[PDB]
């Protein structure tokens, strides 16, 4: 059809219609816009996450495999909204990257220079948008994460993914084999000493603690003010570290270097790091994103795209421009820093990033 983009000739098309199209002898149409919803925080509208993509792939495969469609092209479609068209196009591209092993330039050719254009993706915060990422960014970020072994749709557990995202089960996502991002637990912790064995923790807090105990979390990093007593993580042998900075601000690079060193120390022991701020989105995305760039060479835009594909809303407001402006620094550090041989009290006896010259000095006895 005319309002339609070809992905595979005679087989896969991407359309946008403000009406419901009727299947023909040669065409089968489907949409998920009325069944798989992006759950916006504020004015963010996408991209759709990995769980939505999994659900889309199940629906797409059922249509592809229905014998009635054996000699039909499939037209995946949305309404004419530039936002909904962006979500549909981005999800079909992510499908081709993750299920069909297409490369970024292959999934991007059909989308390039479409008129009217797709709406670029904005952040989840409350200021006016001033930074956008594109489908190109998201696609490259998801592809790079797949190439680095951070995503594998074939072992992905939709039930666990969707469960733990809920507030009542802890509002967290496993982002990579190394990192969990979560919202701060909250409790009314009794102020005195009590000999009681009874628990005062709410269900989401117990849910976080049980998952962390069973999934090799070895360090919790807290980035916001105290809403719970850290003893509950320490009770189960999990190290707890504050690297607190103010809501809606960007971390000093000293905080970032301490975080990267702390995370590297744990990763080298084989453990996971769970990071939270208040929501587990902005401040948490600054620090995990810096580490991902440091480790895997994502661009800032790719890193934001990948993080939001797993956990919508990460990296908020001015933190986007901050990640963009410091991405070279984070990559630099692979060459200009080493993990300290001396522990720092600032990160609970873990080892911070230090300069090469500091490192060289630490191997000697100062005279």
């Amino acid at each position: 059809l005319d309002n339609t983009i070809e992905f595979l000739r005679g087989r896969v098309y991407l359309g946008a219609y403000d009406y419901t199209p009727e299947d023909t002898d040669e065409l089968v149409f489907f949409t998920v816009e009325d069944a798989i919803f992006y759950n916006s925080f504020h004015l963010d509208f996408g991209p759709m996450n990995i769980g939505h993509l999994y659900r889309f792939a199940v629906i797409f495969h059922e249509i592809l495999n229905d014998p009635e469609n054996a000699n039909k092209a499939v037209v995946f479609y949305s309404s004419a909204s530039t936002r909904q068209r962006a979500n549909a196009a981005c999800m079909l591209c992510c499908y081709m990257i993750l299920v069909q092993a297409w490369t970024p330039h292959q999934v991007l050719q059909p989308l390039a220079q479409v008129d009217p254009p797709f709406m670029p993706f904005r952040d989840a915060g409350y200021s006016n948008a001033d930074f956008e990422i594109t489908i190109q960014d998201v696609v490259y970020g998801v592809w790079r994460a797949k190439e680095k072994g951070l995503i594998d749709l074939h072992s992905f557990n939709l039930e666990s993914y969707e469960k733990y995202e809920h507030v009542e089960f802890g509002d967290f996502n496993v982002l990579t084999p190394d990192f969990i991002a979560f919202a701060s637990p909250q409790e009314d912790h009794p102020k005195g000493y009590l000999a009681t064995k009874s628990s005062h923790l709410n269900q989401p807090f117990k849910s976080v603690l049980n998952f962390f105990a069973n999934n090799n979390v070895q360090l919790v990093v807290r980035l916001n003010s105290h809403l719970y007593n850290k003893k509950h993580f320490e009770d189960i042998g999990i190290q707890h570290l504050d690297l607190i900075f103010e809501d809606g601000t960007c971390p000093d690079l000293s905080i970032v270097k301490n975080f990267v060193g702390a995370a590297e120390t744990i990763i080298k022991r084989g453990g996971k790091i769970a990071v939270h701020c208040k929501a587990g989105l902005g401040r948490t995305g600054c620090l995990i994103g810096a580490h991902l760039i440091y480790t895997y060479g994502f661009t800032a835009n790719e890193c934001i795209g990948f993080l939001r594909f797993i956990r919508p809303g990460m990296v908020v407001g001015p933190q986007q421009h901050w990640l963009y402006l410091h991405q070279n620094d984070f990559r630099e550090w692979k060459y200009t820093t080493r993990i300290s041989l001396k522990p720092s009290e600032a990160i609970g006896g873990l080892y911070p990033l230090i300069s090469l010259e500091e490192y060289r000095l630490q191997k000697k006895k100062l005279k």
Partner: peptide, 11 residues
């Protein structure tokens, strides 16, 4: 998952 995946190779 996705042994049910039809083959949709890039052009």
């Amino acid at each position: 998952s996705f042994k049910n995946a039809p083959l949709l190779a890039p052009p």
